[PDB]
């Protein structure tokens, strides 16, 4: 028989929504998920899945379905995918080349980009090296470009590694906030629990 559902609403509707440099993660325990509810909804801008055919997601069983969440510049949203590179795919949140989860992204211009500018959402540049898959970089070490080490000093060739977005109420479909949620599946052995509605 049908029973409790998964907390998709808690992570989709939600409230003040995690920035990108520390992308929010949520583990979904034993539950039943209704993906068709998300599929049929037209509010979503892009619903692109790199694993199995979305149309029958409701007929496979997983164990450890993860949900990542963050916010991106509207134009630069096609970087949440394997291989792609950039400020959101190379330094902040890079999917593994072998990926088996869907990516969902929808516009939220009205909910953000206040008249005075949101200027709260932060994105990470200036990483000493690359980023391994599914790596969160919450540290705030001051970056340098060669020269001489700066021991917490701030100045030329020693920069803070985070920047604030420039959301404005009328920027365009390009520079508008987009909320992205990555539903990454998993079959890490052990009994499967996250099955279809049946």
């Amino acid at each position, epitope marked *: 028989n049908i029973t409790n559902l998964c907390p998709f609403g808690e992570v989709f509707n939600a409230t003040r929504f995690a920035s990108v440099y520390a992308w929010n993660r949520k583990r979904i325990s034993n539950c039943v998920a209704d993906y068709s509810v998300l599929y049929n909804s037209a509010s979503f801008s892009t619903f692109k899945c790199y694993g199995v055919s979305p149309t029958k997601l409701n007929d496979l069983c997983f164990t450890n379905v993860y949900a990542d969440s963050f916010v991106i510049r509207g134009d630069e949203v096609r970087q949440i995918a394997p291989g792609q590179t950039g400020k959101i795919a190379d330094y902040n949140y890079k999917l593994p080349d072998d990926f088996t989860g869907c990516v969902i992204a929808w516009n939220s211009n009205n909910l953000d980009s206040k008249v005075g500018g949101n200027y709260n959402y932060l994105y990470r540049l200036f990483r000493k*090296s690359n980023l391994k898959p599914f790596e969160r970089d919450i540290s705030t070490e001051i970056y340098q470009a060669g*020269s001489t080490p700066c021991n917490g000093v701030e100045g*030329f060739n020693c920069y803070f590694p985070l*920047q604030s977005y420039g959301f404005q109420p009328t920027n365009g479909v390009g520079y508008q906030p987009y909320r992205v949620v990555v539903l990454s599946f998993e079959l890490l052995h052990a009994p499967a629990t996250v099955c279809g509605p049946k």
Partner: antibody
Amino acid sequence: QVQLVQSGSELKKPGASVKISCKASGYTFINHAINWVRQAPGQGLEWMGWINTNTGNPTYAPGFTGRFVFSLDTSVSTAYLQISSLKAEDTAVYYCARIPIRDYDYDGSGYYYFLDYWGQGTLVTVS
Amino acid sequence: SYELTQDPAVSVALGQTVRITCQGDSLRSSSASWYQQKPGQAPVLVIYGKTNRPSGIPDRFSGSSSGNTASLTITGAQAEDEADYYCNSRDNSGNHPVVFGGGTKLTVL
């Protein structure tokens, strides 16, 4: 001790091609774009283009196709400029520049769109 | 979005504060940066961010921005600046991520 050094002066006849090399030392070369600029005697600098030192795909400024090719050797940390089908009105001094950002779209703030360190530059002359 | 006009005729007193002005219609919602270029030598920056001096020579160089105008300023020892000063800034319209102004030929008696 960041240091960018170009190749020496190059002489060639009109219509041929010129290869220009500039290499950078003292920092992680892979984490900085390489910008290009030209200057003619008595005339101000003009933007040429940039190379993302991760893939290489340039974004040439309008009208600079075919005559200019950008390349990079990461294993040696060097940048190369090819100027084929040269014209007498192309003699100039060329500089390659580093930028604190990997590319230009990375930083959407506009507070780092500047070139920090340059080299001596290469004089290309023909007749 | 195409050029940043300037004026290459700056020479005033050789012993007083000197100003360099740049006008650009695409400088309100953006930043600016200032270089110097001694004849032939490799040019290097003198101001980044319009306020933050560099480690090179942060002694007698200052910068300010007022609306569409960018202003560089020198204070003392005006000599040793027989040079050419150039500007940079972000740009819009998806045509040129950066552009360069005409440049100013700072000459001091």
